[PDB]
Structure formats: structure tokens, C-alpha cells
């Protein structure tokens, strides 16, 4: 259970959590309420695990794309800012945290990946991806490399995959079409083929993660990286002379990074909702609060109008992501495809074919048709194919179901006069196990 009368906040460790903690310390001094800021690894997966039990933080910070899934699980409280507060943030930031009519988070910052480059190694950064192989060749003769970035997280390769035509879900009839997935079209194939080719030709290493790339850039070993504004603070420190610019073009088409709105959701099981609202609206979402965070690690662009007007003067300072529940399937699909293509485990074609399936994993067909004369009232188990390939028909909850034994199983004859048995449970889920004992060899 969550402790009443304090605030526990979770934010990713790459964000300005020390700056956030200072806003927390001021809130503590003014209220006598302890604020604890924590930053567990993989928070975006840990949050729903812990929260569905009524545990977790009072406030969770992530990019808005995760929030639709959280809200559908009932994990997030609906937020209640007055029209006057709403007016202080840009309309489009509110749009990103609106799910099925309701505001489900406060928008904080607008996050976009950029090309970060070392001005000493590369006074003019490339305008195209296509010139990077030649540039790497020149740099290798000097014991440097052109480009290193995180290949383990699909957020960083997506801009190139999307450039020539890849997309997540198509916006059709005023809503994202979850059946229309674009991870396996010509443009997605072309983008990923380029990336694999960079690796095949030793211009990049498949195993490059966040830390190899950040260290490589900051030690002056690579001329370019790809990252968000939060990363600038670490470069500042390193005293590499760096510039920030737009991602290069692929086949003459701009790179297309997926844009995130860092947002702050309130845990539906928190007994501290009015405290969390007060902290967010009156302490964090002020010029002074956002400045405190920005000073730790840059936010880039922010949702708050008054502070964005100051920030827009920064020279260092692409589509908004959907917030739909299917975004986690999408990211998981692309992650897997990229890692498999980059490591040679699959071809680009194979990888992206699997990605299309996995991104649309919520949607087999033949089994549903083979028993559509049923009309059952109340709880039912849906048509389902088991691991052996046996089709279990739509059945009432609380009933044992009987289907013949498969004619063939791994190229093996079985007598179809025998049956297998499966219980459709009282709650409308299939029993995990099927009794196949009777299907004699």
C-alpha cells in the first residue's frame, strides 16, 4: 500500500531527477511533506507491474506513448486542472495526454532526438545518411569513427526507418488504425537495410548500447551521436566542442523521429492525489521549477508557455507518438526486428515480417469461423488454437470441452476417434492445460 502524507516520484535516470528533487525539497520546506524522487531502471515496465497491486509511486514520469496502456489498466487517476491552468500549456501537449476523452497526465517537456556532433572532428555535419560511410572511412584513417548511437533501443533507429515511409499506425478516419501497421513496407525495409549495411561494412557495431555510444562521443572518439536534450548536460561536462542539428536525410527525405511528451501521471491507488496535483501544478509547472530541472539535465522544449518563451532562444533548442495501448507491442516488435537484423540472426525482410505480426499481435482466423453457430449468454472462452494446433471453439464458461485428436502431430498419425479435453473455466478463460492422454500412437 502507498504511504499517506508523502510523495514518491519515479522518473527515468537519464532525466534531471536531482533538479526535480530540489523542487521536491522546496515543497517539503513549505508543506512538511517528504518528497522522494526515485529512478528505477526499466521504470516504464516496472510501473504497471507494481501499480496493478496498489503499490508504486504517487507520480510517474514517462513519455506519453506509454500512458494510454496505463490508463486502460485503470492505473492512472484522471487529472483535474482548471481551464486557467490548462491555458498555460500548449494545446498540442494536452492532446498527447488525452485518452478516451480524459486527461490522464500533466505534460512537462517535448522531447525530440537530434544529431549531436563534435565540431573539432566534423566542422560541417553531413546533410544525408548516404555520406556517412565515406566520412567514416576518412575518420578511421585517423583512428576515429563517424557515428555511434544506441542500437539496442528502437527509439534511436526509428527516425531512419520512418524517413522513406515506415510508420507505426496509420491515422485513418480520425483515429489510429491498429490493423494498418507500417513497419514492413518499402521505406521501412530501405531504412533498416541501410543500417544493416553500415554494420556489415564495419561503420557501426551491432552491440553498441547507450553507454558505449555516450562514452565514445564524450571521449572524442566518434564525430556524431543521436540523442535527446537530456544528454547535452553530460557533453557540457566533457568539454568536447559539440553542436546540435537536425538528423540527416535518407533518400532525400527528412529523418522522422517519434516525438515524446514527457508527462507526469498520478497513480490511481495513491491516497495523495491532491498533494500530487499541488506539487505538479504549483511547484513543478512554474518557470522556477522547470528551470531547476532544466539546469540538471536539459528538457529541450517545454509544455509551459511562459518558460518555453525563454528556452526558444537556445540555438540547440518528426511526429508526436500515439498514446494508444498498442504502442508497447509496436516498440517491442521494432526492438526485436532491429536487434535481429543488426546481428545477422534474420534478414531485414524476415525481421520486419515478424515485426508486422508482433506489432499487430492483438489480432487464429480459421478457428473462430469453425463454430459461429453458437449463441451463448454470459461468460465464454473465445475460439483459440492451442500449442499443438488443435482448435478450441467458442465455449460457455464452466464446461468441459471435447475435440478430436489431431490427424497428424509433427508428421505423426493419430486416431481421430479418440478425443482431447479442455476445461473452459468458470471465469471464461481456458484452462492452461489440455488432456491429450487418450490420443494413442
Amino acid at each position: 500500500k502507498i504511504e499517506e502524507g508523502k510523495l514518491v516520484i519515479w522518473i527515468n535516470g537519464d532525466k534531471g531527477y536531482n533538479g526535480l528533487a530540489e523542487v521536491g525539497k522546496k515543497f517539503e520546506k513549505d508543506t512538511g511533506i517528504k518528497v522522494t524522487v526515485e529512478h528505477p531502471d526499466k521504470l516504464e515496465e516496472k510501473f504497471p507491474q507494481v501499480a496493478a497491486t496498489g503499490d508504486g509511486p504517487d507520480i510517474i514520469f514517462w513519455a506519453h506513448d506509454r500512458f494510454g496502456g496505463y490508463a486502460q489498466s485503470g492505473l492512472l487517476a484522471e487529472i483535474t486542472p482548471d481551464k486557467a491552468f490548462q491555458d498555460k500549456l500548449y494545446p498540442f501537449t494536452w492532446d498527447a495526454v488525452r485518452y478516451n476523452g480524459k486527461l490522464i497526465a500533466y505534460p512537462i517537456a517535448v522531447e525530440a532526438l537530434s544529431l549531436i556532433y563534435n565540431k573539432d572532428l566534423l566542422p560541417n555535419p553531413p546533410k544525408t545518411w548516404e555520406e556517412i560511410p565515406a566520412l567514416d572511412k576518412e575518420l578511421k584513417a585517423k583512428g576515429k569513427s563517424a557515428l555511434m548511437f544506441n542500437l539496442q533501443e528502437p527509439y534511436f533507429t526509428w527516425p531512419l526507418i520512418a524517413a522513406d515511409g515506415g510508420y507505426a499506425f496509420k491515422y485513418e478516419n480520425g483515429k489510429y488504425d491498429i490493423k494498418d501497421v507500417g513497419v514492413d513496407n518499402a521505406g521501412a525495409k530501405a531504412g533498416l537495410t541501410f543500417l544493416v549495411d553500415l554494420i556489415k561494412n564495419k561503420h557501426m557495431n551491432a552491440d553498441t548500447d547507450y553507454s558505449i555510444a555516450e562514452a565514445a562521443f564524450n571521449k572524442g572518439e566518434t564525430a556524431m551521436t543521436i540523442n535527446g536534450p537530456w544528454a547535452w548536460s553530460n557533453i557540457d561536462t566533457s568539454k568536447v566542442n559539440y553542436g546540435v542539428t537536425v538528423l540527416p536525410t535518407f533518400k532525400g527525405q527528412p529523418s522522422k523521429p517519434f516525438v515524446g511528451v514527457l508527462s507526469a501521471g498520478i497513480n490511481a491507488a495513491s491516497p495523495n492525489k491532491e498533494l500530487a496535483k499541488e506539487f505538479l501544478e504549483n511547484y513543478l509547472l512554474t518557470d522556477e521549477g522547470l528551470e531547476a530541472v532544466n539546469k540538471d539535465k536539459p528538457l529541450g522544449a517545454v509544455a509551459l508557455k511562459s518558460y518555453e518563451e525563454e528556452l526558444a532562444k537556445d540555438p540547440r533548442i518528426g511526429e508526436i507518438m500515439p498514446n494508444i495501448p498498442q504502442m508497447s507491442a509496436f516498440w517491442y516488435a521494432v526492438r526485436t526486428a532491429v536487434i535481429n537484423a543488426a546481428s545477422g540472426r534474420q534478414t531485414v525482410d524476415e525481421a520486419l515480417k515478424d515485426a508486422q505480426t508482433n506489432a499487430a499481435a492483438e489480432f487464429d482466423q480459421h478457428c473462430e469461423s469453425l463454430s459461429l453457430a453458437s449463441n451463448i449468454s454470459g461468460l465464454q472462452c473465445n475460439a483459440s488454437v492451442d500449442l499443438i494446433g488443435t482448435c478450441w471453439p467458442r465455449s460457455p464458461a464452466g464446461q468441459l470441452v471435447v475435440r478430436p485428436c489431431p490427424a497428424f502431430f509433427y508428421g505423426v498419425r493419430y486416431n481421430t476417434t479418440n478425443n482431447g479435453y479442455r476445461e473452459c473455466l468458470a471465469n471464461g478463460s481456458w484452462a492452461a492445460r489440455v488432456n491429450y492422454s487418450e490420443c494413442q500412437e
Binding site: 502431430f409 505423426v412 492445460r433 491429450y436 492422454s437
Partner: peptide, 16 residues
């Protein structure tokens, strides 16, 4: 090999 393929199928059906 087929009788072994059968004994190996048994173990599978027994789990599933």
C-alpha cells in the same frame, strides 16, 4: 527413431 519420436511426443502432449 519413430518410436523415439513417439516417446518424445508423449512428453510434449503431457505438458501441453
Amino acid at each position: 527413431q519413430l518410436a523415439q519420436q513417439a516417446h518424445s511426443n508423449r512428453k510434449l502432449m503431457e505438458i501441453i
